[PDB]
RNA sequence: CAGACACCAUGGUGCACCUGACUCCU
RNA sequence: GAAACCAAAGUCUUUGGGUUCCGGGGGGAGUAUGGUUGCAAAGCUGAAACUUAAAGGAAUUGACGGAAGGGCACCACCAGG
RNA sequence: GGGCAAGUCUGGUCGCAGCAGCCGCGGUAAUUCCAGCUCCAAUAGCGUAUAUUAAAGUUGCUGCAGUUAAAAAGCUCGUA
């Protein structure tokens, strides 16, 4: 804890709560638009696209198998 | 250095002393044959160690009760000598030198005695 | 074909007054605030509905000079659904030894919990009279009474514990560590023995300070020792 | 109270309090025993209040009195100065004497060398008898403790202030507390003091 | 300094009942302190109290009883239009069967019970149960 | 890492094969199915017998 | 702890104390009564019924019980020299 | 496994034993070796009287 | 956590102090965070006094004493065992062993 | 207490696994 | 209190003395970016992509030590054959 | 395979193919695959994706934490 508390501090906690809320990882990047920017979804639920290539991915350890993704 | 006496000899020999302190002696071949007579020992050599430690105990216990073993003939005799009368709890300390606050306690108990004095070279107690 | 038996033995002044029909219930000793070392005293008095709940038998271990050494940390709770619950923890090398050990430790450690009403004044208690709480390693388990028909709104571990009390209507809000379930029930056991511990104004009517049935029966207690 | 007159300290008692030195105490500050202190000596040695001694000597006896058995009264003396005294207390009162070590577990410990069932414990020094005082607190046992001006007071029920350490202040109280119970229940009845001296009491002092 | 002359006094008497203590030296003795002391005296949570008149600010010695479990302050205070009063009876009182909340209302400092009976609120003071 | 070559697709599926199992009595649907699930599990004989099972347990 | 007027909800009534005005609960250890015999009134040969006083472990673990019964046996009687 | 070792180990103690122990040793639950010790009563192993005092199978 | 409470020796009532070297390693440690040591010792130590005191003629004067105040760094106090590893319950002890 | 104290690098991998009942019918 | 420990690291779920300051798993990173000072050295304000289901804390138990203190064996020495 | 209800099934596969939100199976006597079968679940829906609300007292106004896990500025005056 540790805070000021009075009868005019609605002006304070309006500023204080959101500015501490900006420190949240989930609050920041979702409200930076970066999830729309770095990732194609975030602004879509489904999105149609052309296959660039078929990528037969050997899995980095652990779980030794071949992933076989697509690009 | 070796073959020091374990739990089995000392626990067994203790019961033998407190019951047979008449019929035990200090000769081994007495007490070895007495531990033939009064005890059931599964080895002669164990009987050698037990009855020998009986002779170790009987030499000790005939010097009165030693530590770790005692006989009620010796124990109650201590209490029979513990009829000791040191006092009558009346010396008489009727009036003698006492503390001035003990005197004040005796003043609250209405007898009084001679009072200590002189707070001098303090700490009184140093 | 195999069967079990029971033999009574008193190890205290109580267990004689238990076996001689002088103490008839734990409610006396619960009023008397006396120790109990015989779980059969409880078994002399109720012997029924005392639901055994093996909570978690969790394998805990210590490392040794030659590899490791493990044991089963079984959590067995007892309770009839009437205002009396218990708990036993037995750390044994076996499971069922740790179970049947903590069964009897649950039997010996049955305690009364004080049920009441939410905003009710009549109706044969359905919840607590007061919001109660308890911690066990930073895991705060707070209990909030509910009226009837609401239910036991809880994590599944205190939901069985509030069930065994007969507190059928309760709200929960818990903070702390999310995985240590034995510390959940041990913090929950703190709140339920706290039900007597809150001083109601109904409890302001003080008692006559009863007179130690050791001394009250000390001549009847003469069997081989008073 | 009983016969109120000799229950308000006789000079036979008063001299014996001075003879056994019970009025003296330690040098340590108290917060529970300073009420029982009459005065302090020059640069501090506490004269205890023998009024507080006697009035607790009465009531702690009265706690033992109207228990119909001294068998569930286990009196405790780890001090060897009181071991003759609790021998002569159990000789007079009939209580259960506890000499020396408590052997931790007589009140707990189902599997044990022993088990006792008292109702009230009487203690020479609750620091010297803290291991009784632990298992007094474990299984709901009240405990009388003889306390000086340096004694512990946690879990200590009704406390008789005495010097009760080393001197015959120990064996005088066991002379007096066996006096007070035979005063109440005994052949030294109707609140009469003893005709038995504390020389059947005070500890052995190895003899010649 | 003492920004809250009640919370500095409530920490006294709670710690007093933690010790089982039957006396406190409270100060700087507002009348708002006194009116809370009078009400809880009527409810039998505590006993009587005796003020010692000083010209510094005055101090009160209070004989209390062990019938109380928690007395708290609303620091800082808030306004109650008799519609928030039940939520403090919800969130801050353990049941709706016992527990009293005191308010300064413009018919005087009173409990929550006369506040509902008169229907004229004011500012919230604190609680005791 | 960087690697992108496929090796085997359906390697286990080409060597693990399937059949079907026909309804001697039907898959009852909706109403009388969910009605059947209670009464079959309890009242046929009324349960007096048994312990330590699930409805598919070789356990 | 009771319910509606004649109806009793609680399983029992736990004991109390007079030194801290605090209850003695369920299985509380060093939470004991103190039975002090009524000794009678110069005629002597103590009269039966012991004066009872319930003591909790809290006033015991805080070391209060010595003056507490002194506030209960001296203050209420009967005791000589008081 | 435990229940048969609850039944017989009781029963050989029911008929009487100064000690009685049951060991089931070797592979169990796949390719891993296990050992199931079910001991009742007192079992000594010192010196010469280990050989006389036991009945082993 | 604080493996030591006083951290060698306390610096309470003092915001900052002067440092010191080791008397046998010259390592910089503070004055009230190091291991100090007085030495009162003869200049005429017992190897020589069986022959010095016999040849000490016109010498009814007593044996002189050397007065040395030693100060170690903690690194060369421990390996030399000026101080050494005690238990953490013994680490509470502010007690120097007697001379 | 109170005589003499050199450098010495590296190094690696799977199985500790989640419940109760006693109609051997003698 | 997670314990460590702490009359404070108490009077907290029975949650509120007042006022200020700061954290939201671990990074990338006080790096980038711009501000900014400082003679400079550098100081200060202060990210993202991407990376992750663990990171961390006490405490128990081992094991280890060019950590320390104990005992014993010619599978270890000594004296030796 | 657990979480998570219902296969310590039956076969195959053998760290492969795959599966697996997470914890995880598969390196041969696979309860994680792939299927069969059996079971469970809801049900004319059910499942997924993404989104957001709670759960979350992990933004803590109620009601967070800041010695050692994140978190008292180097210290002090000192205005808002």
Numbering used by the authors:
A (entry chain Q): 1 to 71
B (entry chain e): 1 to 126
C (entry chain c): 38 to 263
D (entry chain f): 2 to 209
E (entry chain a): 2 to 130
F (entry chain V): 75 to 133
G (entry chain b): 1 to 82
H (entry chain g): 115 to 171
Paper quotes:
During eukaryotic translation initiation, 80S ribosomes are assembled on the messenger RNA. This process is highly regulated and can be divided into several phases: a ternary complex (TC) - consisting of trimeric eukaryotic initiation factor 2 (eIF2), GTP and initiator methionyl-tRNA (Met-tRNAi) - binds to the small ribosomal subunit (40S) to form the 43S pre-initiation complex (43S pre-IC). Subsequently, this 43S pre-IC complex attaches to the 5′-end of the mRNA which contains a cap, forming the 48S (pre-)initiation complex (48S). The largest and most complex of the initiation factors is eIF3, a ∼800 kDa complex.
After refinement and post-processing of Class 1 in RELION, the h-48S complex reconstruction reached an overall resolution of 6.3 Å. The crystal structure of eIF3d fits unambiguously into the cryo-EM reconstruction at the exit of the mRNA channel, but does not contact the mRNA. The additional density in the h-48S map is found next to ribosomal protein uS3, close to uS10 and contacts rRNA helix 16. Based on the cross-links as well as shape and size, we tentatively fitted the structure of the eIF4B RRM into the corresponding density yielding a cross correlation value of 0.931 in Chimera. Therefore, we suggest that eIF4B stabilizes mRNA binding in the h-48S complex by directly contacting the mRNA and the 40S.
